[PDB]
Amino acid sequence: KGEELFTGVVPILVELDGDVNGHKFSVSGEGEGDATYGKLTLKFISTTGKLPVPWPTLVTTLVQCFARYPDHMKRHDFFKSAMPEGYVQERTIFFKDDGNYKTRAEVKFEGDTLVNRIELKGIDFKEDGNILGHKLEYNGWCGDNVYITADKQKNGIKANFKIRHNIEDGGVQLADHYQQNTPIGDGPVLLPDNHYLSTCSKLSKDPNEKRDHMVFLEFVTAAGITL
């Protein structure tokens, strides 16, 4: 049972190779996840200089297998059921009146470490916009809930949710997320009934870190199934 792999605290490593408007960047992340509490503590750094995009826009791209599914919902945890072989998480993130991210990630166990290896490609972004212009507040947020649906054709799931990035001088930058997860292995996975993940994140800085970075705390919990 892939859920048995998450009983305690599990170390995490994240790798992101990015390309926004032809400008490349790389982020390395590490930390740990505690699925019993749906808690994630992660630190991310840029290894290629100041990022061309704001950190909050990469939060969702940079491990839903660490969501806490209550006992009455554990039948619907596709993410852990696909472990240790893992799953492929793909997204298209449409930033309103701006460009879009297209991400492909592999979330799997490499030893005793849960690894998230990401390729990201962004196009059609505006220099005088909120993303390339770095006009987004540096702060976490809650929601919108990650609404998950079963995709029996792909033996996986799909998810849809909107992100509302606070704009520094008032306003919000909408980011429409469309998601699809498919297992890497051939083992039987859990296809869930409709439900959602509730997410609240906290972004902060390390006073001793000199590279462009993001200290990240997150709680993710599953809900939406009655009784």
CA distance 21 to 99: 9
**Of 140, 8, 4, 172, nearest in space to 62 by CA:** 140
Alpha carbon distance 96, 69 (integer Å): 32
Experimental approach was: X-ray
Instruction: Name the amino acid, one letter, at 23.
Output: H
Looking up tokens 């995009």 gives 53
Helices (H) and strands (E) counted in the chain, each on its own, are: 2, 11
Closest CA to 60 of 205, 175, 183: 175
Q: What does the alpha-carbon distance between residue 82 and residue 190 come to, in Å, rounded to a whole number?
A: 8
222 CB-near residues (< 8 Å, 6+ apart): 67, 68, 69, 70, 73, 76, 77, 195, 196, 197, 198
Tell me, yes or no, whether 226 lies in a domain.
no
CA–CA distance from 146 to each of 33, 50, 135, 187 (Å)?
19, 30, 25, 25
Q: Which two tokens stand for residue 32?
A: 């740990």
φ and ψ of 66, to 5 deg: -95, 5
The residue behind tokens 């926004």 is 20
Tell me the residue length of the chain. Answer: 227
Residue 4 lies in a domain: no
Name the nearest CA neighbour of 21 among 120, 90, 105: 120
- CATH number, domain containing residue 67: 2.40.155.10
Strands (E), 52-167: 87-95, 100-110, 113-123, 146-151, 156-166
**Cα–Cα dist 39/148, whole Å:** 19
Confirm if 157 and 123 have CB atoms less than 8 A apart: no
Q: Is residue 72 part of a domain?
A: yes
Distance (Å) of CA 27 to CA 63, 140, 141: 15, 19, 21
* Distance (Å) of CA 45 to CA 27, 102, 223: 5, 21, 32
d(CA 158, CA 178): 8
3 neighbors 76 (Cβ within 8 angstroms): no
What's the structural domain count of the chain?
A: 1
Residue pair 32/9 in contact (Cβ under 8 Å)? The answer is yes
Alpha-carbon distance 72 to 89, whole Å? Answer: 25
- The answer to whether the beta carbons of residues 186 and 203 sit under 8 Å apart is no
CA–CA separation, 83 and 187 (whole Å): 9
Neighbours of 36 (CB within 10 A): 12
Query: What range defines the domain where residue 102 resides?
Result: 9-221
- For residue 172, the one-letter residue type is V
Greatest alpha-carbon pair distance for the chain in Å reads 50
- Whether 36 is in a domain gets the answer yes
Residue 51, CB half-sphere, CA atoms under 13 Å: how many? 21
Burial tier of 170 (Cβ tally within 10 Å: 0-12, 13-18, 19+): exposed
How many angstroms separate the Cα of 125 from the Cα of each of 88, 100, 133, 179, 220?
26, 7, 10, 20, 30
Is 1 within the bounds of a domain?
Answer: no
136 within some domain? yes
In a domain, 202, yes or no: yes
Q: Residue 42: beta bridge partners?
A: 31, 216
**Residue 2 within a domain:** no
Q: What is the CA radius of gyration of the chain?
A: 17
2 near 83, Cβ under 8 Å? Answer: yes
- Resolution given for this structure, in angstroms: 2.2
